[PDB]
Design a protein around this motif. Structure first.
Motif, PDB file in Angstrom:
ATOM      1  N   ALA A  52       0.769  -1.238   0.000  1.00  0.00           N
ATOM      2  CA  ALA A  52       0.000   0.000   0.000  1.00  0.00           C
ATOM      3  C   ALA A  52       0.810   1.304   0.000  1.00  0.00           C
ATOM      4  O   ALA A  52       0.253   2.360  -0.227  1.00  0.00           O
ATOM      5  CB  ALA A  52      -0.957   0.006   1.219  1.00  0.00           C
ATOM      6  N   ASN A  53       2.103   1.241   0.256  1.00  0.00           N
ATOM      7  CA  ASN A  53       2.935   2.433   0.338  1.00  0.00           C
ATOM      8  C   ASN A  53       4.120   2.283  -0.630  1.00  0.00           C
ATOM      9  O   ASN A  53       5.008   1.469  -0.366  1.00  0.00           O
ATOM     10  CB  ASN A  53       3.445   2.500   1.787  1.00  0.00           C
ATOM     11  N   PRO A  54       4.194   3.089  -1.694  1.00  0.00           N
ATOM     12  CA  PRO A  54       5.284   2.978  -2.673  1.00  0.00           C
ATOM     13  C   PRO A  54       6.683   3.289  -2.178  1.00  0.00           C
ATOM     14  O   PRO A  54       7.641   3.032  -2.900  1.00  0.00           O
ATOM     15  CB  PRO A  54       4.886   3.934  -3.811  1.00  0.00           C
ATOM     16  N   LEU A  55       6.789   3.831  -0.963  1.00  0.00           N
ATOM     17  CA  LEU A  55       8.104   4.120  -0.366  1.00  0.00           C
ATOM     18  C   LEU A  55       8.716   2.828   0.166  1.00  0.00           C
ATOM     19  O   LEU A  55       9.901   2.795   0.422  1.00  0.00           O
ATOM     20  CB  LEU A  55       7.943   5.101   0.778  1.00  0.00           C
ATOM     21  N   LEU A  56       7.905   1.783   0.275  1.00  0.00           N
ATOM     22  CA  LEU A  56       8.374   0.477   0.773  1.00  0.00           C
ATOM     23  C   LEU A  56       8.572  -0.440  -0.398  1.00  0.00           C
ATOM     24  O   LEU A  56       7.749  -0.472  -1.359  1.00  0.00           O
ATOM     25  CB  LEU A  56       7.325  -0.151   1.718  1.00  0.00           C
ATOM     26  N   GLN A  57       9.658  -1.209  -0.337  1.00  0.00           N
ATOM     27  CA  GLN A  57       9.942  -2.228  -1.353  1.00  0.00           C
ATOM     28  C   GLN A  57      10.219  -3.494  -0.595  1.00  0.00           C
ATOM     29  O   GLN A  57      10.832  -3.454   0.501  1.00  0.00           O
ATOM     30  CB  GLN A  57      11.212  -1.893  -2.155  1.00  0.00           C
ATOM     31  N   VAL A  58       9.695  -4.626  -1.047  1.00  0.00           N
ATOM     32  CA  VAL A  58      10.039  -5.869  -0.351  1.00  0.00           C
ATOM     33  C   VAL A  58      10.266  -6.910  -1.457  1.00  0.00           C
ATOM     34  O   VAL A  58       9.403  -7.135  -2.319  1.00  0.00           O
ATOM     35  CB  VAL A  58       8.943  -6.343   0.677  1.00  0.00           C
ATOM     36  N   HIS A  59      11.420  -7.532  -1.428  1.00  0.00           N
ATOM     37  CA  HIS A  59      11.775  -8.571  -2.401  1.00  0.00           C
ATOM     38  C   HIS A  59      11.843  -9.918  -1.692  1.00  0.00           C
ATOM     39  O   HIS A  59      12.318 -10.002  -0.546  1.00  0.00           O
ATOM     40  CB  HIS A  59      13.155  -8.329  -2.993  1.00  0.00           C
ATOM     41  N   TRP A  60      11.393 -10.988  -2.349  1.00  0.00           N
ATOM     42  CA  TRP A  60      11.428 -12.305  -1.735  1.00  0.00           C
ATOM     43  C   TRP A  60      12.433 -13.090  -2.549  1.00  0.00           C
ATOM     44  O   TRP A  60      12.365 -13.093  -3.797  1.00  0.00           O
ATOM     45  CB  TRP A  60      10.049 -12.970  -1.836  1.00  0.00           C
ATOM     46  N   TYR A  61      13.310 -13.794  -1.859  1.00  0.00           N
ATOM     47  CA  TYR A  61      14.406 -14.567  -2.495  1.00  0.00           C
ATOM     48  C   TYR A  61      13.951 -16.012  -2.313  1.00  0.00           C
ATOM     49  O   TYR A  61      14.123 -16.594  -1.283  1.00  0.00           O
ATOM     50  CB  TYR A  61      15.731 -14.261  -1.756  1.00  0.00           C
ATOM     51  N   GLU A  62      13.412 -16.585  -3.400  1.00  0.00           N
ATOM     52  CA  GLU A  62      12.752 -17.865  -3.218  1.00  0.00           C
ATOM     53  C   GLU A  62      13.553 -19.050  -2.790  1.00  0.00           C
ATOM     54  O   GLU A  62      12.966 -20.004  -2.264  1.00  0.00           O
ATOM     55  CB  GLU A  62      11.942 -18.210  -4.499  1.00  0.00           C
ATOM     56  N   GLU A  63      14.877 -19.028  -2.999  1.00  0.00           N
ATOM     57  CA  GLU A  63      15.684 -20.126  -2.632  1.00  0.00           C
ATOM     58  C   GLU A  63      16.513 -19.863  -1.384  1.00  0.00           C
ATOM     59  O   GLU A  63      17.484 -20.560  -1.119  1.00  0.00           O
ATOM     60  CB  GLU A  63      16.639 -20.457  -3.807  1.00  0.00           C
TER      61      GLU A  63
END
Length: 233
Positions: free
Chosen positions: A188-199
């Motif tokens: 909901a907030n474009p100032l936040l970024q979250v990346h998921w590293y699947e392995e």
């Protein structure tokens, strides 16, 4: 390990040490590093080195100084890991945010400071990075595998400066339902970024950890450096 002579004071009067690294070219933006549950240990020394080599100054405060100043625990030693979990369970998170706020203020005006300050935290420090981002104390914040972020989602609208989070897709501190909450909430907030590293799981950026994953640590680290680069003069 801490840098002898370095002392920072928190709003409530408590003072604490820190491990400091200055780059050859200064002034430079300063990165406050928020520790894991082992205190300011070899991985923190390595993180200071990495940042200094990328041209930043770095300040890693002794967040466990309210409990036991100078704690630096070896994660390969079972007894010291037990000590780390005991200190984490007793850790005052609010006081931790306040000590990081004090370290950020300190980082604004050292001889080597260019006045911009970022924050990079790992695990316990990753959770603290989000809390600090909600306060707005730093220019940019980064959290690697912060724990318990799915319980702090009411703070998402409070984030008014960029914050980047790297999470492992096999990190069982963040199971699927928690990942969904965080993903939807931060979304909901474009100032936040979250990346998921699947392995990758927890501790994936620490080369000595059994959870180390070289490809995820490298992708995350480059994203972190690209995210911090605007703080450079």
């Amino acid at each position: 390990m801490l840098t002898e002579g370095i002392s920072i004071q928190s709003y409530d009067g408590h003072t604490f040490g820190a491990l400091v690294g200055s780059p050859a070219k200064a002034p430079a933006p300063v990165i406050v590093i928020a520790q894991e549950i082992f205190g300011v240990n070899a991985f923190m020394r390595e993180t200071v080195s990495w940042l200094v080599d990328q041209g930043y100054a770095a300040v890693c405060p002794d967040l466990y100084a309210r409990q036991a100043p100078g704690t630096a625990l070896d994660p390969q030693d079972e007894r010291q890991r037990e000590q780390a979990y005991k200190l984490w369970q007793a850790f005052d998170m609010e006081a931790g945010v306040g000590d990081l706020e004090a370290a950020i203020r300190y980082a604004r005006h050292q001889p080597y400071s260019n006045g911009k300050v970022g924050l990079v935290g790992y695990s316990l420090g990753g959770a603290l990075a989000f809390l600090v981002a909600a306060k707005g104390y730093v220019d940019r914040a980064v959290g690697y595998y912060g724990v318990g972020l799915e319980k702090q989602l009411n703070k998402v609208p409070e984030v008014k400066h960029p914050a980047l989070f790297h999470m492992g897709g096999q990190d069982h501190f963040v199971p699927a339902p928690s990942r969904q909450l965080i993903t939807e909430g931060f979304g909901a907030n474009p100032l936040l970024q979250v990346h998921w590293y699947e392995e990758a799981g927890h501790s994936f950026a620490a080369t000595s950890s059994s959870g180390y994953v070289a490809s995820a640590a490298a992708l995350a680290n480059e994203r972190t450096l690209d995210f911090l680069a605007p703080l450079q003069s």
